[PDB]
Amino acid sequence: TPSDLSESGSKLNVDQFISSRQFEVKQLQLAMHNSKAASSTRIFQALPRKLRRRTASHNVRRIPK
């Protein structure tokens, strides 16, 4: 399994997560792009600043006193 247990919690390893699933990623990329899969350029465009958002905190919230 690509994930492991620890004393703290349950952690995920990216390495095996993508290494075990390589042929599936290849099939997905060939299903999305058929003629540009053999090429190597920049296909995906940058996110527009209008759609860009900001990151919040990891805590829940703070109650009033």
């Binding site: 703290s8 995920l12 190597s40």
Partner: protein, 38 residues
């Protein structure tokens, strides 16, 4: 651990414009924690 690194390099050369930067500026985390913050 050469092959999966090369594959994700080929993966970044599609989205990003300079694929070799996230590894040098240490932007590809090998581990990501999944636990409610205490």
């Amino acid at each position: 651990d050469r092959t999966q690194t090369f594959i994700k390099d080929c993966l970044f050369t599609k989205c990003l414009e300079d694929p070799e930067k996230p590894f040098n500026e240490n932007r590809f985390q090998d581990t990501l924690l999944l636990l409610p913050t205490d």
